[PDB]
Amino acid sequence: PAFHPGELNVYSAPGDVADVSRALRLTGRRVMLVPTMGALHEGHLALVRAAKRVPGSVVVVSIFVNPMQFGAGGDLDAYPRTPDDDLAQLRAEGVEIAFTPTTAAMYPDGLRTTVQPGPLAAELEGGPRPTHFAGVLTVVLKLLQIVRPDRVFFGEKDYQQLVLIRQLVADFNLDVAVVGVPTVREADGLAMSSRNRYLDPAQRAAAVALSAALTAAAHAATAGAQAALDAARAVLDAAPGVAVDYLELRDIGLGNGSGRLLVAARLGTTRLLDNIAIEIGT
Amino acid sequence: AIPAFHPGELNVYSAPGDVADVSRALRLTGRRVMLVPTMGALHEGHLALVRAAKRVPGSVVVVSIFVNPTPDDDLAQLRAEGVEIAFTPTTAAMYPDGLRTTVQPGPLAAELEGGPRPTHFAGVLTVVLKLLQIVRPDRVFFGEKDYQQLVLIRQLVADFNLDVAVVGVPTVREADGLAMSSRNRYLDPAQRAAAVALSAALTAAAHAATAGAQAALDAARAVLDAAPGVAVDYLELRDIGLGPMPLNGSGRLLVAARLGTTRLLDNIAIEIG
Ligand SMILES: O=C(O)c1cc2ccccc2o1
Ligand SMILES: O=C(O)c1cc2ccccc2o1
């Protein structure tokens, strides 16, 4: 396949992106990978920019709505799809490679060999959806194998995901560095997500409570962990038809001092996640 | 700041990161890295794998030895085969975080070998994935003796999009056809005499196969039937990927049996018609 530099090159075949990737690496360029599910927004763009700023980089953005991380009924047919836009944003960012595989090319033998996560996959987000992270890690492994990048980028918004990815990478000895990138927020603090378009004016207004509780907790934390949790709790209780799924304070690896506070809540049918770093006593 | 590597010599590394560094540096200088994963206690069967890997123009041979949960003799054979890298890591080096993320095999891992040991191949594929990631060879060598295993590794490679050729090396046998294995040494003399029936039965079957699949199966069974003290766990004809037997065409006939406490396996290629 052709590679036209300083331009967006779009490959659909794993073979084609694998060949270009390998060729670019043998020419000294450093391969950056940003796995996305499309519907790009400014949170994905921060990920591209981090990769862009790595000296000698050639950036691969992949776009694949992976039917293995979704479960019935349900969420798969409803995922936002906007490839036109996505590709334009990527041209505008000066990304050179977009990898957009077909389901058939990724799953020619269906679900056969898969990745089985550690017990962290059974908690938090994986509580209701116990096969969700196995689907995520399977496609992430396939993607790293196809593209073999130097580094791979993930937002901290999906913190649990990032942690399991660091697990996949360590546990399977993958020669790739995992770059966590801080969450991009709207001007009021709402963590940017494509699930956000599904909020109406009211819920969009109520939605600010997640970030506010979290940031309230981050500051109340000098008074310790009960104080941080109770502060976030209070903010969430004062917010109209925000229904809290969970609100949990964990170690940063997700097992006082330094931790991570995590929230999941529904607004109508729209499930939102957010998290923040927490220093207990600091 | 790469670890020390002396060409034409046996270099031993126990650190994953060391063998990863050497291997990467060697490929840049135009050697082709060949991996031969072993579990130690090398016999001729392992040596046939090593020899295949040496055949490749440009090869540097990496032999891992690791027991998945003979030290000086094994290395002496490797030095004697002219192998240049052994990878002899600890359990803690390979599993510093315990069993956390693992490989889940497809349904074939539940059959055959299979039913007695339901989690065996999960262990196998996981460790093999890791060796592949550590060493990143161009080619990886497995004996056909453990044929279900080879099939499942080929599935790993395909399914996870791994950049490596799987090379399957024919079974080394003793003079009477008994598939070589470190277990063979446990057999008393009666058992060792009766153990010839597994290969005997498989080669009878392979030759009976001009008459079709039932004649092959029946010739194999007659031969096992004529052996005392041989408990047959399965005798099965499958296609070459271990799916069900197609009506004509290439297949594989596999057998497992228990002789006292010692469990023996064998397998053969079959052409129906
Ligand atoms: O668009 C995203 O937020 C995204 C996509 C994606 C693909 C595989 C694993 C994790 C992922 O996060
Ligand atoms: O000694 C062997 O035949 C052997 C070694 C090995 C290592 C990983 C997976 C399977 C394996 O078989």
Swiss-Prot record, chain A:
Compartment(s) where it occurs, according to its Swiss-Prot or TrEMBL record: Cytoplasm
Impact upon substituting residue 69 to A: More than 1000-fold reduction in activity and 45-fold decrease in adenylate formation
Signal peptide from the UniProt entry: none
Family, similarity comment: Belongs to the pantothenate synthetase family.
InterPro entries from the UniProt entry: Pantoate_ligase, Pantoate_ligase_C, Rossmann-like_a/b/a_fold
Annotated protein name in UniProt: Pantothenate synthetase
Gene encoding the protein: panC
Catalytic activity: (R)-pantoate + beta-alanine + ATP = (R)-pantothenate + AMP + diphosphate + H(+)
Family matches, as Pfam families: Pantoate_ligase (PF02569)
Misc remark: The reaction proceeds by a bi uni uni bi ping pong mechanism. Was identified as a high-confidence drug target.
EC number: 6.3.2.1
Curated annotation (Swiss-Prot), chain B:
UniProt note: phenotype after gene disruption: Simultaneous disruption of panD and panC gives a mutant unable to grow in the absence of panothenate. The double mutant has a highly attenuated disease response in BALB/c and SCID mice; immunocompromised BALB/c SCID mice survive on average 36 weeks as opposed to 5 weeks for mice infected with wild-type bacteria, while immunocompetent BALB/c mice survive indefinitely. In wild-type mice bacteria grow for 3 weeks then undergo a steady decline, bacteria persist over 8 months in SCID mice.
Name recorded for this polypeptide: Pantothenate synthetase
Gene expressing this chain: panC
Entry keyword Phosphoprotein: no
Biological source species: Mycobacterium tuberculosis (strain ATCC 25618 / H37Rv)
Active site, UniProt feature: 46 (proton donor)
Pathway(s) the chain acts in: Cofactor biosynthesis; (R)-pantothenate biosynthesis; (R)-pantothenate from (R)-pantoate and beta-alanine: step 1/1
GO biological process: beta-alanine metabolic process; pantothenate biosynthetic process
Note: The reaction proceeds by a bi uni uni bi ping pong mechanism.
Record-listed Mg(2+) binding positions: 73-74, 77
One Gene Ontology term, aspect cellular component: cytosol
